[PDB]
């Protein structure tokens, strides 16, 4: 019954994979699924994959230091990998690193990608455990985040080669209200203009008759190309959406739910914390929705209490919400979105939210 | 009613303070208490303090990278601090960094410490917010972990200068069975022999007529000085206590509970995971306890199910248990201990547990 929307998973690079992974277990309803580490011969990195219906996260941490003087000298390729991982956690901190797509024909989707100028990160190769085989490749897309192409061949195991399945459920979830998340809706690994642009232009040059590997990126780039804020050291009436819009190296990963009220509630009660949109947003939005005769399913007054956002067109609307920044840097957010016939991505909420500080800064 | 046993707190250095701190909120029953960061002018580090009755943890993360090229050039003292924090997370990873003691007369306890050869880390100084003042100092003790001496003067605020109080309770705890932890029982920031020794000899030279700042370290060094394992690539019948005993740079922090059964249960059900001691341990222990006429309060059979450990003497016993390593390095553990008239620290369980693999390796 589960539904990946073609996303194999998203892999994070984080300092404490083992413990950070549990954040999503306790706060957001995930379940431990697979593991890769010193128990399956991974001498240099541990990986913890937690899943929520279609949503699958991988958290990956080095298990050892750079010049680890006690046991082995690291092979040259591997010390470079460890070195790379620390330099990313320094520059960026905990965050999404790689979006990986279930793909038929990695060789082909990889080939076209670099023909049109993709920065290669991992030419096609074939990780091969005892449960089978898989072909992957990877390319730089949005900043230093990446896309990975995955073609299952003979592999049958839990997840990928090297991974072992997970030995049973998590107990904290028999006490916690569940979070009905469906699948990964989209992901922008870096929201700098230059960076976004660069990645979008690259995607456009990847368009052909064969369908592009990430429909959700093609529609984001399309919707936001039709147009390309202002802060205050007050807090800002936009609160942390101003950091979302104007912060550097900001990311967000969005997670589709069939019920954003149910989702947001059970996350409010598990202890997750979202940005507060001002009252003036709903003021103006209630008129816009009414004048346009767009009648929502959900009570407008509950969408207000929950600081949930709205965008729409003639055929339907979306419901959107953002967590407070997940870490001590204001750079990583998670979006929860519910669609009722709207392929949109929230372009309207830039105008609306920017207009929200507008009436407040114009107030003086 | 709360009881710190003279421990102001333990401060961890971790990669993701904001999220790691919540681990202890969800998995172990802590509550958010104070915060220090970009919201109180801390341009370089964030601190999250969570408390459980007497137990108070501080988690501290850099909010910025080393050569953060976007905003400020860091002052020389501060870039050194950021640089230091990354080098510790590289060499060691997430773990306890500093044990801090509520102390009258920092100047004096600091003075004697370095007279007898303490490695100074922070001469007496006086952090001074608008709610008052505090004197601190710090010295290297066990490896690169530290002790900090804290003398409240005019400070009245939540916690320390720069900290703001915490805006209300965590919701996940109205759904989770509580964990009745009392206070910090002890802490060994590095269990290498050389390192332990060095720190103990240093403590001994700190003994005088004035009482020593950490009674729990003086008794550890005393009990374990009366004596100073063997592993298998099988897993080991000792399971992860072999990593505890023979692993390098292992730490553990112990947390006293009045009811280790209640504590361990509610932690089993919140999702915390402990090492399994073999059956042969309880086999031999039931005879030892009986021959010695030591009658326990708690059902021996529940202490067996819960992989809880036992040490005792003529006047009473202790009950001990260890988590599985908390991170992808096998280097940080947490001990839960319950005392019934026994100042011991588990020296007996070395003999018992070492003897447990003994009958198993002797089995062949
Ligand atoms: C509202 C939100 O969820 C965000 C999203 O999910 C998809 C994003 O793509 C862009 C792009 C470029 C064109 O792709 C852009 O230029 C701006 C100014 C922008 O604001 C966004 C985004 C970040 C959007 O704001
Ligand atoms: C059982 C446990 O809780 C541990 C504890 O809490 C206090 C520790 O101090 C030592 C010391 C030195 C003398 O202090 C030592 O040499 C050995 C071999 C030792 O094993 C321990 C410890 C680590 C003990 O094992
Ligand atoms: Co969005
Ligand atoms: Co102990």
From Swiss-Prot, chains A, B:
Metabolic or biological pathway, per its Swiss-Prot or TrEMBL entry: Amino-acid degradation; L-phenylalanine degradation; acetoacetate and fumarate from L-phenylalanine: step 3/6
Domain of life, source organism: Eukaryota
Binding site for Fe cation: 186, 252, 335
PROSITE patterns hit by this protein: VOC (PS51819)
Cofactor: binding comment: Binds 1 Fe cation per subunit.
Annotated catalysed reactions: 3-(4-hydroxyphenyl)pyruvate + O2 = homogentisate + CO2
Cofactor(s) in the UniProt record: Fe cation
First-level EC class: oxidoreductase
Gene Ontology molecular-function annotations: 4-hydroxyphenylpyruvate dioxygenase activity; metal ion binding
Enzyme Commission numbers on file: 1.13.11.27
Entry annotated with the keyword Ion transport: no
Limits of the VOC domain: 6-152, 183-324
Entry keyword set: Dioxygenase, Iron, Metal-binding, Oxidoreductase, Phenylalanine catabolism, Repeat, Tyrosine catabolism
InterPro entries: 4OHPhenylPyrv_dOase, 4OHPhenylPyrv_dOase_C, 4OHPhenylPyrv_dOase_N, Glyas_Bleomycin-R_OHBP_Dase, Glyas_Fos-R_dOase_dom, VOC
GO biological process: L-phenylalanine catabolic process; tyrosine catabolic process
NCBIfam families linked to this entry: 4HPPD (TIGR01263)
Family classification: Belongs to the 4HPPD family.
The name this protein goes by in its record: 4-hydroxyphenylpyruvate dioxygenase
Organism: Zymoseptoria tritici (Speckled leaf blotch fungus)
Gene name of the record: HPPD
């Amino acid at each position: 019954e589960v539904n990946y929307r073609g996303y194999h998973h998203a892999e994070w690079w984080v300092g404490n994979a083992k413990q950070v992974a549990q954040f999503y277990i306790t706060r957001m309803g995930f379940e431990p699924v697979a593991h890769k580490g010193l128990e399956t011969g991974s001498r240099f990195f541990a990986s913890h994959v937690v899943q929520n219906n279609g949503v699958r996260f991988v958290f990956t941490s080095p298990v050892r230091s750079s010049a680890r003087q006690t046991l082995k000298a690291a092979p040259l390729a591997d010390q470079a990998r460890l070195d790379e991982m620390y330099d990313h956690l320094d520059k960026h901190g905990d965050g999404v690193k790689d979006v990986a797509f279930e793909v038929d024909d990695v060789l082909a989707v990889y080939e076209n990608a670099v023909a049109n100028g993709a920065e290669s990160v991992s030419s096609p190769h074939t990780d091969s455990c005892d449960e089978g085989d898989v072909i992957s490749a990877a390319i730089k897309t949005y900043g230093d985040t990446t896309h990975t192409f995955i073609q299952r061949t003979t592999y049958t195991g839990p997840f990928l080669p090297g991974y072992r399945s997970c030995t049973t459920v998590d107990s904290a979830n028999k006490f916690l209200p569940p979070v009905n998340l469906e699948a990964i809706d989209h992901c922008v690994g870096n929201q700098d203009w230059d960076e976004m642009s660069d990645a979008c232009d690259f995607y456009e040059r990847c368009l052909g008759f064969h369908r592009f590997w990430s429909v959700d990126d093609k529609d984001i780039c399309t919707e936001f190309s039709a147009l390309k804020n202002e802060p205050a050291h007050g807090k800002s009436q936009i609160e942390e959406y101003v950091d979302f819009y104007n912060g550097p190296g900001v990311q967000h990963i969005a997670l589709r739910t069939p019920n954003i009220i149910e989702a947001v509630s059970n996350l409010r009660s598990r202890g997750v914390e979202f940005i507060s949109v001002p009252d003036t947003y709903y003021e103006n939005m209630r008129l816009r929705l009414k004048a346009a005769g767009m009648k929502l399913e959900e009570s407008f007054d509950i969408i207000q209490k929950l600081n949930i956002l709205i965008d729409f067109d003639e055929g339907g609307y979306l419901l959107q919400l953002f967590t407070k920044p997940l870490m001590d840097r204001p750079t990583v957010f998670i979006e929860i979105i519910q669609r009722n016939n709207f392929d949109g991505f929230g372009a309207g909420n830039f105008k609306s939210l920017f207009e929200a500080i507008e009436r407040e800064q114009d107030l003086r």
